[PDB]
XYZ file of C-alpha atoms in Angstrom:
115
model
C 71.737 93.362 109.184
C 68.467 94.113 106.932
C 67.185 97.121 108.190
C 69.758 97.824 110.470
C 72.392 100.300 110.567
C 75.124 101.301 112.533
C 75.297 106.188 112.007
C 76.510 106.681 108.007
C 80.234 108.407 108.455
C 80.109 111.211 106.503
C 83.367 109.708 103.618
C 82.086 112.695 100.757
C 85.535 113.962 101.305
C 87.295 110.709 100.857
C 88.254 110.886 97.419
C 89.836 114.512 98.072
C 91.618 113.797 101.427
C 93.448 110.665 99.532
C 93.980 112.690 96.099
C 96.076 114.827 98.582
C 97.615 112.195 100.422
C 98.757 110.721 96.714
C 100.167 114.301 95.846
C 102.275 115.084 99.757
C 103.187 110.636 98.731
C 104.429 111.334 94.822
C 106.363 114.858 95.942
C 108.232 113.285 98.938
C 112.258 112.876 98.030
C 112.505 109.116 99.000
C 109.359 108.787 95.991
C 111.720 108.278 93.279
C 111.190 103.907 92.889
C 107.754 104.126 92.853
C 107.243 106.553 90.255
C 106.203 104.969 87.756
C 105.640 101.226 86.893
C 109.487 98.223 86.974
C 110.299 97.748 83.551
C 108.977 94.386 83.391
C 111.378 93.808 79.993
C 114.564 95.680 82.114
C 114.001 94.544 84.896
C 115.069 90.481 85.634
C 112.508 88.515 88.116
C 110.657 91.835 88.159
C 107.846 89.660 86.186
C 107.798 86.007 87.820
C 107.867 87.413 91.534
C 106.196 90.059 92.368
C 101.892 88.678 91.592
C 100.988 92.401 92.086
C 102.693 95.468 90.130
C 101.681 98.452 92.005
C 103.396 102.142 91.203
C 102.217 105.611 92.234
C 101.439 106.593 88.592
C 99.173 103.547 88.686
C 96.842 104.425 91.787
C 96.707 108.582 90.487
C 94.930 106.906 87.973
C 92.938 104.572 89.139
C 91.877 107.417 91.337
C 91.604 110.134 88.564
C 88.516 107.058 87.055
C 86.535 106.009 89.965
C 87.884 102.728 89.964
C 88.823 102.648 93.850
C 84.684 101.915 96.062
C 86.466 103.413 98.641
C 89.315 104.528 101.211
C 90.217 100.619 102.305
C 90.640 100.055 98.880
C 93.366 102.942 97.749
C 95.109 102.078 101.324
C 95.275 98.688 99.967
C 97.067 99.288 96.618
C 99.180 101.634 98.669
C 100.616 99.280 101.268
C 100.938 96.696 98.105
C 103.588 99.393 97.169
C 105.971 99.238 100.455
C 104.630 95.229 100.792
C 106.310 94.971 96.131
C 109.821 96.533 97.512
C 109.521 94.753 100.341
C 109.719 90.891 98.683
C 111.846 92.370 96.263
C 114.593 94.657 97.412
C 117.459 93.919 99.979
C 116.463 96.593 103.864
C 120.058 97.803 103.066
C 119.751 99.532 99.547
C 118.795 102.521 98.999
C 116.207 101.537 97.480
C 114.868 98.897 100.042
C 114.926 102.088 102.421
C 113.443 104.615 100.562
C 109.781 102.375 100.455
C 110.500 102.384 104.568
C 110.692 105.893 104.823
C 107.366 106.074 102.424
C 105.640 103.523 103.970
C 106.229 105.175 107.868
C 105.419 108.605 106.118
C 101.785 107.347 104.674
C 100.693 105.197 107.313
C 101.238 108.305 109.814
C 99.254 110.318 107.551
C 96.626 107.407 106.959
C 95.812 107.896 110.549
C 96.081 111.447 111.297
C 93.683 112.007 107.996
C 91.216 109.062 108.507
C 91.715 107.721 112.193
């Protein structure tokens, strides 16, 4: 509360470490459904159904331009990518399985880096 603060957790490396995690996700062989925004002109249903589209290129641009206020807002956008994928794709599709694999991969890097 006012003039009463918990000790300062060092966040000075967070930007660099989120960038490293994002590089690792970008270079994973199963990243291909997630590298670019879904083409809203060419994929029926996507625009209406997926209220907040997100992809790795869009996170990379946000990261590079100071649009994440903290590491939690970064993780929210990453998870959004996989949440959208599960909303639109059957679990037993190539894209559906890619999304499960990538979410697993991300959550381990996240825990190992920050928890």
